[PDB]
Design a protein around this ligand. Structure first.
Ligand SMILES: *SC[C@H](NC(=O)CC[C@H](N)C(=O)O)C(=O)NCC(=O)O
Ligand SMILES: *SC[C@H](NC(=O)CC[C@H](N)C(=O)O)C(=O)NCC(=O)O
Lengths: 206, 206
């Protein structure tokens, strides 16, 4: 099959899909659209929502987590039965929540930069609610010494990686009391296929 | 298996799961917890996030959409292959977005009532972005005369129903230019198993 990823020149909400493609060794068109060009087409497209995954130059699927789950099931980075999928999903959705609240500090619902302390406090609260739960949740398998699903890396571990990259640039110390999360992120970034993708990827501020 | 749904006395983020249980004819413990009682246990529970689905008095899975997808796959109200699942997911996630922004007008991230115009405008924008896309998306199958996945009702149609109930109480006219969405909601509410559940369910303001 053929894949096209539509998004801005950001890591942002599409980065989970890029990591999935990189991990699976699957080539795709990585379409990075300038904001004003996207903005001028908005009222002319049946599907305007960003990011969006296009399959076989045909089917358009927006909603970043829906896109990621599809790539995960396709490439074998999701759960293998219903229970396992539920676990991969709640972990991933928890990290999406963090990323979503982070993005809401800077961007409106129409993708415009909003460049106040209230949004930052929502974000910081969202971290305090979620991260200790994720540290514990990770510990459920293999004492938390490996991945969220034991020895198989899945989209949950990738979400843990990409969702926290910006928060870590803003506050490099914020994961200091979640040592298992840090070793997992370090494990993901050194994983086969993932190391070279991450080291050769363009440097963007989001 | 055995099911327990934990949430407040609200329709809110858990209502998708209740509809799923009702549609599948599956009995569960519908646990409606008073807020202050939930609040007093918060720092004593490994999993404090609301809503939460408990399986066999054992596994705790929060994240309302993760919970719903699990019940949907279990009961047969999800897609039957990867592509179909991606379509059910983006539709459901679009409606979650609407519901999420609606809930953010009234509740903080710690479940407290925040009872300003800014949050309402985010919400209203989110409706304008999403609803026309959903009207069109529905039209992809069977001219939009049936359900999002043709003749099978899935969690996507249920989301379309429960996500808009409160917005419709606040503005009963807001779906007037999406006639296919309205006929779908009316189709869901008269569906077998769903009609009696909806007519006998407790009246709550959220
Ligand atoms: S760029 C801002 C808007 N995107 C989203 O909010 C997508 C949210 C999904 N939950 C996701 O992909 O995670 C956006 O695309 N606004 C423009 C529009 O036409 O919808
Ligand atoms: S009640 C407010 C918080 N709930 C959520 O935000 C859950 C969001 C998920 N995305 C979902 O289920 O849809 C909450 O539970 N805060 C308390 C806590 O301990 O996390």
């Amino acid at each position: 099959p053929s894949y096209t990823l539509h998004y801005f020149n950001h890591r942002g909400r599409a980065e989970i899909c890029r990591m999935l493609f990189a991990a699976a060794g699957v080539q795709y068109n990585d379409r990075r659209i300038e904001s004003s060009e996207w903005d001028s087409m908005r009222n002319k497209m049946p599907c305007h929502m960003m990011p969006m995954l296009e399959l076989d130059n045909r089917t358009q699927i927006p909603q970043s987590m829906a896109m990621a789950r599809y790539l995960a099931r396709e490439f074998g980075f999701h759960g293998r039965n219903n229970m396992e999928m539920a676990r991969v999903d709640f972990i991933s959705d928890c990290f999406y929540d963090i990323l979503d609240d982070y993005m809401r500090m800077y961007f409106d619902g129409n993708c415009r930069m909003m460049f106040s302390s209230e949004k930052r406090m929502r974000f910081q609260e969202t971290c305090r609610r979620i991260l200790p739960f994720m540290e514990r949740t990770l510990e459920m398998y293999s004492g938390g010494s490996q991945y969220f699903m034991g020895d198989q890396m899945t989209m949950a571990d990738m979400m843990c990686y990409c969702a926290l990259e910006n928060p870590l640039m803003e506050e490099p110390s914020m994961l200091s009391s979640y040592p298992k999360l840090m070793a997992l992120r370090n494990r993901v970034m050194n994983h086969s296929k993932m190391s070279s993708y991450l080291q050769r990827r363009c440097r963007t501020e989001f």
